[PDB]
Curated annotation (Swiss-Prot), chain A:
Subcellular location: Cytoplasm
Annotated binding of ATP, by residue: A14, G15
Family: Belongs to the TCP-1 chaperonin family.
Protein name: T-complex protein 1 subunit zeta
Subunit structure: Component of the chaperonin-containing T-complex (TRiC), a hexadecamer composed of two identical back-to-back stacked rings enclosing a protein folding chamber. Each ring is made up of eight different subunits: TCP1/CCT1, CCT2, CCT3, CCT4, CCT5, CCT6A/CCT6, CCT7, CCT8. Interacts with PACRG.
Function: Component of the chaperonin-containing T-complex (TRiC), a molecular chaperone complex that assists the folding of actin, tubulin and other proteins upon ATP hydrolysis. The TRiC complex mediates the folding of WRAP53/TCAB1, thereby regulating telomere maintenance.
UniProtKB/Swiss-Prot annotation, chain B:
Phylogenetic classification of the source organism: Eukaryota, Metazoa, Chordata, Craniata, Vertebrata
Residues of the full protein shown: 398 to 461 of 545
Family: Belongs to the TCP-1 chaperonin family.
Associated pathology: Neurodevelopmental disorder with speech or visual impairment and brain hypomyelination: An autosomal dominant disorder characterized by global developmental delay, impaired intellectual development, poor or absent speech, and brain abnormalities including hypomyelination, cerebellar atrophy, and optic nerve atrophy. Some patients have severe visual impairment, dystonic movements, and seizures.
Subcellular location: Cytoplasm
Biological role: Component of the chaperonin-containing T-complex (TRiC), a molecular chaperone complex that assists the folding of actin, tubulin and other proteins upon ATP hydrolysis. The TRiC complex mediates the folding of WRAP53/TCAB1, thereby regulating telomere maintenance. As part of the TRiC complex may play a role in the assembly of BBSome, a complex involved in ciliogenesis regulating transports vesicles to the cilia.
Residue numbers binding ADP: G14
Species of origin: Homo sapiens
Protein name in UniProt: T-complex protein 1 subunit gamma
Residues annotated with Phosphothreonine modification: T33, T62
Quaternary data: Component of the chaperonin-containing T-complex (TRiC), a hexadecamer composed of two identical back-to-back stacked rings enclosing a protein folding chamber. Each ring is made up of eight different subunits: TCP1/CCT1, CCT2, CCT3, CCT4, CCT5, CCT6A/CCT6, CCT7, CCT8. Interacts with PACRG. Interacts with DNAAF4. Interacts with DLEC1.
Binding-site residues, ATP: G14
Length: 64, 64
């Protein structure tokens, strides 16, 4: 919490930002090999574990 | 036909068919408050299994 006062900047929690970068990532935009284009794919995946477990731990699914 | 010709009444199906009586049944069990109430509890949700199957049929969260 001190970071909230220690940093005048803060950033949204509760998944709001999570799906965004994933949407914005546009994995094909890395075209070089798939060195990047594949490693960005697990990335947007790794991004969304934050909503996952929260959507997970309740009813429905995480994805749902 | 001869079943409709048998029976000239017909019902909105699914959980509508299912969820209707359990209440009255529980309403009975609540009112009847015997140990017969316990079947009317045991009776209550047995209506909802095909709805569970219906919730299977849609492929959704049943408990919800």
């Amino acid at each position: 919490v001190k970071n909230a006062i220690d940093d005048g900047c803060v950033v949204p929690g509760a998944g709001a930002v999570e799906v965004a970068m994933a949407e914005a990532l546009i994995k094909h935009k890395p075209s070089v090999k798939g060195r990047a284009q594949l490693g960005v794919q697990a990335f947007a995946d790794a991004l969304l574990i934050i909503p996952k477990v929260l959507a997970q731990n309740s009813g429905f699914d995480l994805q749902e | 036909c001869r079943n409709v010709l048998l029976d000239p009444q017909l019902v909105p199906g699914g959980g509508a068919s299912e969820m209707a009586v359990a209440h009255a049944l529980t309403e009975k069990s609540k009112a009847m408050t015997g140990v017969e109430q316990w079947p009317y509890r045991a009776v209550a949700q047995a209506l909802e299994v095909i709805p569970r199957t219906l919730i299977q049929n849609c492929g959704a969260s049943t408990i919800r």
